[PDB]
Design a protein around this ligand. Structure first.
Ligand SMILES: O=C(O)[C@H]1O[C@H](O[C@@H]2[C@H](O)[C@@H](O)[C@@H](O[C@@H]3[C@H](O)[C@@H](O)[C@@H](O)O[C@@H]3C(=O)O)O[C@@H]2C(=O)O)[C@H](O)[C@@H](O)[C@H]1O
Ligand code: CA
Ligand code: CA
Ligand code: CA
Length: 399
C-alpha cells in the first residue's frame, strides 16, 4: 500500500493499542483528496462531523498564514487596532510594571490579535484521517495541526515555523521571566490513536536566532513541535526528524492535571533530535516508551544550545531503551532534567558520546517505572542507532 493507505503496524508502539491506528485507510473514493493550498486543506478536513475515513495527500508547500485568496498575511493583518509592540513592551517592562501578570489594554489587545492569527493557522484534524506528503517536498508552513479526535495518521510532511506574531510576556515564568507563544506544529489535545511518522519539524526560515531579546529574554515566536495534552493517549511517533528548535515535545501540560495519570501512553522511536534545546520529551504522568532515538547537539551552540534530552516531570514513567546522545562534554547526569514529583526512570543501553551510561542512576532516580512495553518492533543495538536514524528519519526519506 502507499503512504496514504498504510496503517500503523499491530506491534508498533502505543498507537497500536486496542482499536489501533488505521487513520483513513478505509476511505471511499470521494473521501480521498489532494491539497496544495490552505483553502483546499481546510475544505478537505471539513469540521469535527467529518468522521468518514479520509485520505489527504499534500502536494508541495501549504502556507497557513494566508487569506481566503491565498494572499500572505503578516503581523499588521492580524493586529488588533489597539495592539502596538512598542506600547506592549513599555506597559510590561519589569522595571516599571514589576512581576505582576500583564493585564490592561495592551495585553487584552495582544490576546485579541493572537486569536485573529489562530483563526488562520490552527486547524483541527477530524477522526479517521490520514494526511501524508506526496513526494519528497510536502510542507506545512506556519501551520498548527490540532488533534482532539481518534484515529489519525500524519506522515512524510515537513512542518516548518509554527510562528506566533504575538508572544505573551510572563514575568514569573522562571526567575527572570519568559516569552510564551501558542502554536505547535502538531498539538495533540486529548487526541487518541495517532501515528506521526517520517515527518520533519523545524523553525523554517525564522529560527530563534533571528528573534531579538526583550527584557533580556528571547522573544519566542514558537512553541512545541509535537505536544500532547489533556488525556492524549495511544500515540506512536516514529522516524521523525526534529531539528533547530527550542521546546520539542511536552507530554502532559500541567502538574495539576492529575487526570493525565494512566494516560499519555506514547511511543517515541527512531526519531532524530538535532539542535533541539529541551523537552525531547518532557513527560508528566505518562507511560512513555523512548527507544532507538538519536540526540545530537552542543551546549555551547549560539542558536539552539542543548539543555536536556528527557524531562522527568511529575509522576512520569519513561521507559528508555538503546537511545544514543551525542553532546560533547555533557555528563551522564545532565542528559536529563528532573522536576519535582519525578522520581523514576528506566533506561538501558543509553550511549552518551560513545560510552554506555545509566542516566537514571546518575540522577538518584528509581530504576522501576512500574511497566514494561509490550507493543514495539525490533530494537536496534545502540551501536546502530546513529546510522539508522540519520539515514531513515524525517520527511522525504520515503515518498
Ligand atoms: O502544552 C503546552 O505547550 C504547555 O506550555 C506551557 O508549559 C510548558 C511546561 O509544561 C511548563 O512547565 C513551562 O516550562 C518551564 C519554563 O517555562 C521553560 O522556560 C523551561 O525552562 O522549561 C520549564 C519546564 O520544563 O517546566 O513552560 C513550558 C513551555 O513554555 O512550553 C504552558 O505554561 C502550558 O499551559 C501549556 O500551554
Ligand atoms: Ca514557559
Ligand atoms: Ca508551550
Ligand atoms: Ca504547545
Amino acid at each position: 500500500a502507499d503512504l496514504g493507505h498504510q496503517t500503523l503496524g499491530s506491534n508498533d508502539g502505543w498507537g497500536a493499542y486496542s482499536t489501533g491506528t488505521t487513520g483513513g485507510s478505509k476511505a471511499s473514493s470521494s473521501n480521498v483528496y489532494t491539497v496544495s493550498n490552505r483553502n483546499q486543506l481546510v475544505s478537505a478536513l471539513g469540521k469535527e462531523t467529518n468522521t468518514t475515513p479520509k485520505i489527504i495527500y499534500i502536494k508541495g508547500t501549504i502556507d497557513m498564514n494566508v487569506d481566503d485568496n491565498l494572499k500572505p498575511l503578516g503581523l499588521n493583518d492580524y493586529k488588533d487596532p489597539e495592539y502596538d509592540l512598542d506600547k506592549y513592551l513599555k506597559a510590561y517592562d519589569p522595571s516599571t510594571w514589576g512581576k505582576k501578570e500583564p493585564s490592561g489594554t495592551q495585553e487584552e489587545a495582544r490576546a485579541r490579535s493572537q486569536k485573529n492569527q489562530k483563526a488562520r493557522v490552527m486547524v483541527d484534524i477530524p477522526a479517521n484521517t490520514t494526511i501524508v506528503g506526496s513526494g519528497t517536498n510536502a510542507k506545512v508552513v506556519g501551520g498548527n495541526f490540532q488533534i482532539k479526535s481518534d484515529n489519525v495518521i500524519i506522515r512524510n510532511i515537513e512542518f516548518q515555523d509554527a510562528y506566533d506574531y504575538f508572544p505573551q510576556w510572563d514575568p514569573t515564568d522562571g526567575s527572570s521571566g519568559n516569552w510564551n507563544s501558542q502554536y505547535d506544529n502538531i498539538t495533540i489535545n486529548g487526541g487518541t490513536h495517532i501515528w506521526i511518522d517520517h515527518c520533519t519539524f523545524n523553525d523554517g526560515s525564522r529560527p530563534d536566532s533571528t528573534s531579538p531579546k526583550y527584557y533580556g529574554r528571547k522573544y519566542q515566536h514558537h512553541d512545541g513541535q509535537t505536544d500532547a495534552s489533556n488525556g492524549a493517549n495511544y500515540i506512536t511517533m516514529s522516524y521523525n526528524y526534529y531539528h533547530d528548535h527550542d521546546k520539542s515535545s511536552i507530554f502532559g501540560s500541567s502538574d495539576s492535571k492529575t487526570s493525565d495519570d494512566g494516560k499519555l501512553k506514547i511511543t517515541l522511536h527512531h526519531n532524530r533530535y538535532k539542535n533541539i534545546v529541551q523537552a525531547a520529551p518532557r513527560v508528566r504522568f505518562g507511560q512513555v516508551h523512548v527507544y532507538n532515538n538519536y540526540y545530537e547537539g552542543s551546549t555551547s551552540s549560539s542558536s539552539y544550545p542543548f539543555s536536556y534530552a528527557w524531562g522527568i516531570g511529575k509522576s512520569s514513567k519513561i521507559y528508555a531503551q538503546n537511545n544514543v546522545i551525542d553532546v560533547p562534554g555533557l555528563s551522564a547526569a545532565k542528559t536529563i532534567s528532573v522536576f519535582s514529583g519525578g522520581t523514576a526512570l528506566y533506561d538501558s543501553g543509553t550511549l552518551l558520546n560513545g560510552t554506555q551510561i545509566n542516566a537514571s542512576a546518575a540522577n538518584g532516580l528509581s530504576s522501576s517505572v512500574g511497566w514494561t512495553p509490550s507493543l514495539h518492533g525490533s530494537i536496534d543495538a545502540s551501536a546502530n542507532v546513529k546510522s539508522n536514524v540519520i539515514n531513515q528519519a524525517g520527511a522525504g526519506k520515503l515518498n
